[PDB]
C-alpha cells in the first residue's frame, strides 16, 4: 500500500506541486504521477527531457 507521509488523503485541499497537469486518474495515483512520472505524462517531459 501507499502509506508513507509523502502521499496524501483524497480529501486534501492542501496544495500539491503539479496537480493541474493531470486527468482521468485517482488522486493517490495522481500524486504518484508527479513523483515518478511515466514517459507519456507531461510531468515527465517538463523535467527529464532534453531540450
Amino acid at each position: 500500500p501507499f502509506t508513507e507521509p509523502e502521499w496524501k488523503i483524497p480529501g486534501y485541499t492542501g496544495y500539491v506541486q503539479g496537480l493541474q497537469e493531470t486527468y482521468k486518474k485517482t488522486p493517490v495515483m495522481a500524486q504518484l504521477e508527479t513523483k515518478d512520472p511515466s514517459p507519456e505524462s507531461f510531468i515527465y517531459t517538463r523535467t527529464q527531457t532534453a531540450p
Binding site: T3, P5, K8, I9, P10, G11, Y12, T13, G14
Partner: protein, 427 residues
C-alpha cells in the same frame, strides 16, 4: 452497545484529536488501524483487520481538518468522516448558523445517517464544540436542532467549552454564548461544562507545569470523557450506562448543567511519594480547586452527583468515603433530594498516554455533578451581554448576515428565565 460522537468547531475537533488518541492505544490499536470485543463501542472492525472510528469531524475552515489528514493519525480516520468547508464562520454565530450552516449540515447529517446504519445498539450522541466560536455555536446549534427531529428520544451528552470569566480569547464571545445557550437548552439532555481557565489552573497546581498549552488541556479532557464512558467498554463490579445521566442527574427538563471533576491529578515524581487511597481521591474531587469549570461549588447546593471509579477499587471504602462526604457541613445538598449519589465502579485502571504529564495510577475517580452555582455562570456572562447590547456593538455583523434583532432580545429573555430557576430551585 455503540456510541457515535461528533466533533464540531476548532476546539471540538482538537479535543477529538486527543480523545481518539487515547482510545486507540487503550485498546491497543496501532495508529494506522489494526493490531500487531471492547472496542465494539468506538471502532467498527471492517474487512480484514482494520478498525475505523465512529466519529465525524466537520469544520468550515479547511486548515485544522486537513492537518489531521496529514498528521500522525492518517490511516486511522476514514477519507470521508472528515468534513471541511471552504471558509469559516469567524466568531459570528449568525454567519455559522444560517449562511454556511445550511449548505454543509445536510451533507453532515446524511453522513451520520449511514453511521447509525452499520451500528446496531446506538446508545446516544456526545458532542464537542466551543460555544464561543463561530462553528461551535453555529454549526452545533444548527445540527443539534436537526438531530433532535430525526432521533429525538436518544440522549445527548454535551462537552462544551465555555468562555472563562475574566480570561478570554475573542472579543465577541458573550454574543455567541447566549445565542447558542438559547438553543442548547431545548435539545441537549445532559450538558457537561468545561472551562479553559479552571484547567489552566489544574495544570499549574497539580502537574505544576507553569506555562501549559492546549495539548496539555486536551489530554486531560480526553481522560474525563474516557472515564465516564468506561462502563460500556469494559466490565466492572457496578457499572452505570450512558442513560443513567438522563435519569440520575436531571431533575427538571431545563436544569441540565453539570460540573466535572477528575482525580488524582499527579505528575510522575509526586506520584510514588503520595499515598493513593480511595479516602482522598474521593476527597480530591470535591475541593473547588479540582473542577474543570471556574465556579465555586460552595456557593450553591448540589442537586445530584454521580461518581465514576476506575481500576483497583473495592466497593467497601467507596461507601465509607462518600459517607463522610455527607457529614461535611462545608458542602450542602438540596433538601429536595436527600439522596443524591450515583456510584459506578469499573475494573480498568487509567491508561496514560506515552509521554504524558500524568503518572500510572492504580485507580481514578471522575465526578459529574449538577449544582446551582452554575446559575452564577449564566448570570456573570449575562451581565457582560447587556453592556455590549445597549451600544448595539458588533450587531451589524449579525443583521448584515441575515439574522435580526429579535433573537438578541429574546435569547436575553430566555436566559433571563434560567436565572429565576437556579434562584428558585436553590430555595
Amino acid at each position: 452497545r455503540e456510541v457515535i460522537s461528533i466533533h464540531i468547531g476548532q476546539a471540538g475537533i482538537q479535543v477529538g484529536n486527543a480523545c481518539w488518541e487515547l482510545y486507540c492505544l487503550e485498546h491497543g490499536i496501532q495508529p494506522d488501524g489494526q493490531m500487531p470485543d471492547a472496542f465494539n463501542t468506538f471502532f467498527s472492525e471492517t474487512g480484514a483487520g482494520k478498525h475505523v472510528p465512529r466519529c465525524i469531524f466537520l469544520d468550515l475552515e479547511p486548515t485544522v481538518v486537513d492537518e489531521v489528514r496529514t498528521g500522525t493519525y492518517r490511516q486511522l480516520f476514514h477519507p470521508e468522516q472528515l468534513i471541511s468547508g471552504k471558509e469559516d464562520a469567524a466568531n459570528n454565530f449568525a454567519r455559522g448558523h444560517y449562511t454556511i450552516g445550511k449548505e454543509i449540515v445536510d451533507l453532515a447529517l446524511d453522513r451520520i445517517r449511514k453511521l447509525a446504519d452499520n451500528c446496531t445498539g446506538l446508545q446516544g450522541f456526545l458532542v464537542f464544540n466551543a460555544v464561543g466560536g463561530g462553528t461551535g455555536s453555529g454549526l452545533g446549534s444548527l445540527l443539534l436542532e436537526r438531530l433532535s427531529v430525526d432521533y429525538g428520544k436518544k440522549s445527548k451528552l454535551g462537552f462544551t467549552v465555555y468562555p472563562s470569566p475574566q480570561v478570554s480569547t475573542a472579543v465577541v464571545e458573550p454574543y455567541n454564548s447566549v445565542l447558542s445557550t438559547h438553543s442548547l437548552l431545548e435539545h441537549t439532555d445532559v450538558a457537561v461544562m468545561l472551562d479553559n481557565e479552571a484547567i489552566y489552573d489544574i495544570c499549574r497546581r497539580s502537574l505544576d507545569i507553569e506555562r501549559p498549552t492546549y495539548t496539555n488541556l486536551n489530554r486531560l479532557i480526553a481522560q474525563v470523557i474516557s472515564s465516564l464512558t468506561a462502563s460500556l467498554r469494559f466490565d466492572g463490579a457496578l457499572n452505570v450506562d450512558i442513560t443513567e445521566f438522563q435519569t440520575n442527574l436531571v431533575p427538571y427538563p431545563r436544569i441540565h448543567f453539570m460540573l466535572s471533576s477528575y482525580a488524582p491529578i499527579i505528575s510522575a515524581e509526586k506520584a510514588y511519594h503520595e499515598q493513593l487511597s480511595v479516602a482522598e481521591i474521593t476527597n480530591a474531587a470535591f475541593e473547588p480547586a479540582s473542577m474543570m469549570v471556574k465556579c465555586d461549588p460552595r456557593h450553591g447546593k448540589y442537586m445530584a452527583c454521580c461518581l465514576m471509579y476506575r481500576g483497583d477499587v473495592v466497593p467497601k471504602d467507596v461507601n465509607a468515603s462518600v459517607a463522610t462526604i455527607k457529614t461535611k457541613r462545608t458542602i450542602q445538598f438540596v433538601d429536595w433530594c436527600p439522596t443524591g449519589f450515583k456510584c459506578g465502579i469499573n475494573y480498568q485502571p487509567p491508561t496514560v498516554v506515552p509521554g504524558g504529564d500524568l503518572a500510572k495510577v492504580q485507580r481514578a475517580v471522575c465526578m459529574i455533578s449538577n449544582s446551582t452555582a452554575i446559575g452564577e455562570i449564566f448570570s456573570r456572562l449575562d451581565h457582560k451581554f447587556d453592556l455590549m447590547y445597549a451600544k448595539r456593538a458588533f450587531v451589524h455583523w449579525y443583521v448584515g448576515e441575515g439574522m435580526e434583532e429579535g433573537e438578541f432580545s429574546e435569547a436575553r429573555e430566555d436566559l433571563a428565565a434560567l436565572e429565576k430557576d437556579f434562584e428558585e430551585v436553590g430555595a
